[PDB]
Design a protein around this ligand. Structure first.
Ligand SMILES: *[C@@H]1O[C@H](CO)[C@@H](O)[C@H](O)[C@H]1NC(C)=O
Ligand SMILES: *[C@@H]1O[C@H](CO)[C@@H](O)[C@H](O)[C@H]1NC(C)=O
Lengths: 172, 319
């Protein structure tokens, strides 16, 4: 996709992540953990269901039309009836082909996008306390126990708490 | 400085392939088929009013052929016309056949209104051994075979019906074609015959045509059926010097005609669906269908493709 996160600098997805589309995987002194991120997951799901709803109902409520099957050829009038219908079918098939290609292109960019927005959000929370390792991971330059990790995940992490420790670990 | 936090996304073991503008096989975590390619093996009698012609096609139902009695009074959204319907009456044709069939189908009902036509001296209710109704010689119960008087007299017919109602009327009449000059005279005496039906704004003149024709259920003769529409304020004149298959009355026409006809052998079942194809009803929320261009009701749009998958998830990159 356009942002180069999914199938990009994030090498692969996590089969273990079963209660969300996006999430956090960490390692600290006391262990490891994987948790879903609700906000980014919901943002992607909302946009895709939005597409589904606009799609799964326009309306084509048709009754009396024209004859479309013929036993024997009749000439001029039958040629036109056949040609009208054949023309209609090709145009609608074309619409259907293009719609799905456009929708799918966009859906892939949307989800790549939401992955990148989450990465950028966490990046901004961390400020000067962490460095991008290049694969969707931050190296955190201070001790960060399970409550610290959770504070990052729920958006209450306060970088000023750890900044002196982090700066000292980064640059010396 | 050494703890690590990684941001990522889900994956599954095996996803679904979809198309984009650039790639025709991209694997995504979930996808949704947009082309309905399965139909029910029956037609749903609900929510649309379906009327089964059974052994009668809609033209024979309008004419009142034997066995077509169940169609009297019948009202429909969609008339289901069976491919194995069969003529059970006097061999006929309609010169503008599809146009009459279209009008009947679209009108959506068989509401017949009886009128008495005071035919001077000619005999009425002429019947035929080709139109048996329980072995009794009979005829189209919406038509009246007029022949000679027994005193060998078929004089000029001249009766008018005025439409002063609040609905347009459909009159279906016919012209009989004998196979030799003899029959012409043993039926209508005069030779040639002829019928001329007119309105204030229209008119139609028919010459009967006499000659050898193939045998259709034991006969060489034919009837040619015609129709006239009489608006409110208009009226209709029947003139005959022979060969008129006169009408018994007129069909009621709805001002707004919203119905149609579906020709298929598919049985009528118990399901609920507002979309019917000649292959059966569709029960679906998909926007497209590849089952048949012949489709009636509230339907997905017909397309050529057998499958079109919409991505409903991100790219699938497992491990
Ligand atoms: C009957 O025909 C005569 C001429 O043959 C015409 O003058 C008359 O108006 C017609 N009347 C009706 C009721 O058709
Ligand atoms: C409709 O598509 C299916 C595959 O989804 C295919 O098997 C079937 O033959 C198609 N029907 C027609 C009439 O092309």
């Amino acid at each position: 996709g356009l942002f180069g996160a999914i199938a990009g600098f994030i090498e692969n997805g996590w089969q273990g992540l079963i209660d969300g589309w996006y999430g956090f995987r960490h390692q600290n002194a006391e262990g490891t953990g994987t948790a879903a991120d609700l906000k980014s997951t919901q943002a992607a799901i909302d946009q895709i269901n939005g597409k589904l709803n606009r799609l799964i109902e326009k309306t084509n409520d048709k009754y009396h039309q024209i004859e479309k099957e013929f036993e024997q050829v009749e000439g001029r009038i039958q040629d036109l009836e056949k040609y009208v219908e054949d023309t209609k079918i090709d145009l609608w098939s074309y619409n259907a082909e293009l719609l799905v290609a456009l929708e799918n292109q966009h859906t892939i960019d949307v989800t790549d996008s939401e992955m990148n927005k989450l990465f950028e959000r966490v990046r901004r929370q961390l400020r000067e306390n962490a460095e991008d390792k290049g694969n969707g991971c931050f190296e955190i330059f201070h001790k960060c126990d399970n409550n610290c990790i959770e504070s990052i995940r729920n958006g209450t992490y306060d970088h000023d708490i750890y900044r002196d420790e982090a700066i000292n670990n980064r640059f010396q | 400085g050494n703890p690590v936090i990684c941001m990522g996304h889900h994956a599954v073991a095996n996803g679904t392939m979809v198309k984009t503008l650039a790639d025709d096989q991209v694997e995504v975590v979930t996808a949704q088929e947009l082309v309905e390619s399965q139909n029910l093996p029956e037609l749903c009698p609900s929510p649309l009013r379906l009327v089964d012609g059974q052994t009668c096609d809609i033209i024979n139902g309008a004419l009142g052929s034997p066995g077509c009695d169940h169609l009297n009074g019948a009202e429909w959204d969609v008339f289901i016309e069976r491919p194995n319907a069969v003529d059970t009456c006097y061999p006929f044709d309609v010169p503008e056949y599809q146009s009459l069939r279209s009008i009947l189908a679209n009108n959506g009902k068989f509401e017949f209104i009886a009128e008495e036509f005071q035919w001077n001296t000619v005999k009425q209710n002429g019947k035929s051994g080709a139109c048996k109704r329980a072995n009794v010689n009979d005829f189209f119960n919406r038509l009246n075979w007029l022949v000679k008087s027994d005193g060998n007299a078929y004089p000029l017919q001249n009766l008018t019906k005025i439409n002063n109602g609040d609905y347009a009327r459909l009159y279906i009449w016919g012209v009989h074609h004998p196979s030799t000059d003899t029959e012409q005279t043993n039926l209508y005496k005069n030779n040639p015959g002829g019928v001329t039906v007119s309105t204030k704004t229209s008119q139609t003149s028919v010459v009967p045509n006499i000659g050898s024709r193939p045998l259709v259920r034991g006969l060489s003769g034919r009837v040619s059926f015609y129709w006239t529409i009489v608006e409110p304020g208009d009226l209709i004149v029947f003139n005959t010097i022979g060969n008129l298959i006169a009408p018994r009355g007129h069909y009621k026409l709805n001002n707004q005609k919203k119905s149609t006809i579906l020709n298929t052998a598919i049985p009528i079942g118990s399901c609920v669906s507002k979309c019917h194809t000649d292959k059966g009803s569709l029960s679906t929320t998909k926007p497209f269908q590849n089952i048949s261009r012949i489709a009636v009701g509230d339907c997905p749009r017909y397309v050529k493709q057998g499958s079109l998958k919409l991505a409903t998830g991100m790219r699938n990159i497992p491990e």
